[PDB]
Amino acid sequence: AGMFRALFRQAVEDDRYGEFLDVLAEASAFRPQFASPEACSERLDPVLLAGGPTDAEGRAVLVGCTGTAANGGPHEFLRLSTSFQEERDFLAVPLPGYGTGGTALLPADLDTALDAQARAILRAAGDAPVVLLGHSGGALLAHELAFRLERAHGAPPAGIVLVDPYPPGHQEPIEVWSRQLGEGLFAGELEPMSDARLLAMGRYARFLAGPRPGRSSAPVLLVRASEPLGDWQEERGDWRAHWDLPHTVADVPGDHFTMMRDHAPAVAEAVLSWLDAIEG
Amino acid sequence: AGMFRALFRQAVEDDRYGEFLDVLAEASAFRPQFASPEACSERLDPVLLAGGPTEGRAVLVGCTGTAANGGPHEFLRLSTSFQEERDFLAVPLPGYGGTALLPADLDTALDAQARAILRAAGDAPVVLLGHSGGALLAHELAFRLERAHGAPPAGIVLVDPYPPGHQEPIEVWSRQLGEGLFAGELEPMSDARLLAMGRYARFLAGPRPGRSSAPVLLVRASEPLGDWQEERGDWRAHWDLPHTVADVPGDHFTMMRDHAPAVAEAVLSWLDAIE
Ligand SMILES: *P(=O)(O)CC(=O)[C@H](C)[C@@H](O)CC
Ligand SMILES: *P(=O)(O)CC(=O)[C@H](C)[C@@H](O)CC
Ligand SMILES: [Mg+2]
């Protein structure tokens, strides 16, 4: 439902996912924007998706950072969150610009979006230490948020969980598997991706390609898929997700998509074990 | 209407017409295309809009321009001044017509139009006519007819052309151009037609094979479309060494909007001189 989705479908069909994402990014510049975190069109109130034991003092809460995928939304963390029930509080925070009302305004810049989320999270979490968690584009967003919280809000997270991140220096698998990634996005549709949400996705992709100098002091858990998403020539190097100097690395069953789709308990299990290790 | 129109409207507000046209061009790459003149999804049969007296007298062929808000009505006001004087045919621009396939390149579109024009005109000499982007297209078609179809037209009428190397005034006035498109809307510009417009704008910025030998009538607006400092030079439309130059009242838009009879009069006088 919309020209942009028809164009996107054709671009994937023609193996030009990367070229089309640049088009979405350029076109997104002409969507109405918010320039201050106060001027955000949506209420970014996190949703509590799992509850920890009533038992509840100085214990870290999980914050799921919604990813960039235009087919995403409130359903993203439902499978993963069930594995945190009776273990940890799990809050899912929306990503600004993906909402309806009257479509949501897009952030003028990434810091503006991060500030809006940071405020929402600090209000919701109260005094509890926060561990940020994201998958793919959301993993990249989780780190950027962690740095923003530390520098602009004096509130560095207790940790960051990065599920299958592909940061700017490790792009080759993204490029070699762009058809599978584009196909994965159509495969994951519950409804047709709207043009507004495809534009939001392009705007964030471009934000995340740009110069992001700061490194969070929070410790990092790197969670990596164990199965390749598609064919990969061995002499290219390692296809696996990467992060510079993680505190801990965990490997789980599944590929880039199925690690969360079919093997969410294994992801949750890695996170819980790691949180116990960093807390005492 | 569609998202592209909404984005375009904002781009014009932001004085970023040129940037958005580039977005439309890049996006048009992902529309279904035709790569052979025969593979054109649409019938390009010219429509007869005016009838001349009932001999080897030239017929006029209107070359439809690129504007996403244009189409069938483009030459209606002009054509009335040709009734009882000359036959006037309007040829559609491929990709504007389930939506029409876009040409893979300009030559493919030109070939489709050439073939349709040659069967409609028959024995008669053809004088091509276009306005603005359509003027640039009329010349490109004239060249393709001569090169590839062994049939140079008898003349070309260029109504306010701004060819590569001479486009500073239309770049400077791009906001007025964008505003003109929305003002000239009869229905909301579709996303498909906006994409066609970007694709053709890109074709016309590309390197072209050469110059037609057909004589040119250059028709220029007398009033500037926007602000212009005298010290900047001439803002007027340009063509290298035309056979004849005619200046008419109006601006880029109104020369056709309000002053079409003056354009027609210049064309009629010139056809008499070249015949
Ligand atoms: P992920 O969000 O599943 C895949 C990914 O990293 C894409 C290609 C980037 O656009 C996200 C910033
Ligand atoms: P005209 O079509 O009003 C403006 C013009 O000269 C065209 C769009 C060129 O700039 C592009 C071929
Ligand atoms: Mg390293």
Domain containing B14 equals 1-275
Question: Are A20 and B11 inside 8 Å of each other by CB?
Answer: no
Nearest to A249 by CA among A222, A227, A267: A222
Question: Are A11 and B30 inside 8 Å of each other by CB?
Answer: yes
Nearest to B37 by CA among B108, B106, B100, B120: B108
Resolved by: X-ray
Cβ neighbours of A29 in B, within 8 Å: 19
R_g (Cα) of chain A, nearest Å: 18
Angle at B132 between CA B128 and CA B136, to 5 degrees: 55
Ligand sitting nearest the alpha carbon of A68: 1
**Strands of A159-163's sheet in order across:** A47-50, A90-93, A61-65, A130-135, A159-163, A220-225, A248-252
Q: Within the 25-54 window of chain A, which residues sit less than 8 Å (CB to CB) from chain B?
A: 26-27, 29-32
Which stretches within chain B are classed as H helix?
3-13, 17-28, 76-80, 106-121, 133-148, 168-172, 174-183, 191-205, 254-257, 260-274
Both tokens of A51, joined, read 């509850």
- CA dihedral (B152, B157, B160, B161) in degrees, to 10, reads 0
What's the rounded Cα separation, in Å, for the pair B63 and B131?
8
Question: Are A31 and B8 inside 8 Å of each other by CB?
Answer: no
**Ion ligand 3 residues within 5 Å by Cβ:** A 244
Q: A67 with A141: CB under 8 angstroms?
A: yes
Q: B20 with B11: CB under 8 angstroms?
A: yes
R_g (Cα) of chain B, nearest Å: 18
Instruction: Please name the residue that has the structure tokens 């007025």.
Output: B176
Angle at B162 between CA B6 and CA B243, to 5 degrees: 150
**How many domains does chain A divide into?**
1
What's the rounded Cα separation, in Å, for the pair A225 and A175?
17
SS3 of residue A214 by DSSP: coil
CATH number for the domain harbouring residue B124? 3.40.50.1820
Question: Are B3 and A2 inside 8 Å of each other by CB?
Answer: yes
The residue contributing the CA closest to ligand 2 atom 9 is B133
- CA dihedral (B145, B218, B200, B140) in degrees, to 10, reads 20
Q: Looking at the complex, report in whole angstroms how far the Cα of residue B37 sits from the nearest Cα belonging to chain A.
A: 22
Going from the Cα of A170 to the center of ligand 3, the distance in angstroms, rounded, reads 10
What's the rounded Cα separation, in Å, for the pair B20 and B18?
5
Could you give the C-alpha distances from B2 to A1, A195, A241, B7, B195, in angstroms and in order? Answer: 10, 9, 38, 9, 12
Ligand sitting nearest the alpha carbon of B131: 2
Q: Looking at the complex, report in whole angstroms how far the Cα of residue B16 sits from the nearest Cα belonging to chain A.
A: 9
Give the residue numbers of the binding site of A.
68, 137, 164
Both tokens of A152, joined, read 């602009």
Query: What residues contact A109, with CB distance under 8 A and at least 6 apart?
Result: A207
Resolution reading in Å: 2.1
Give the residue numbers of the binding site of A for substrate.
68, 137, 164
**Surface-to-core class of residue B134, CB atoms within 10 Å of its CB (0-12 exposed, 13-18 middle, 19+ buried):** buried
Amino acid (1-letter code) at residue B203: F
Testing ligand 2's pocket by substitution, the residue of B159, B177, B199, B204 carrying the most ligand atoms inside 8 A of its CB is B177
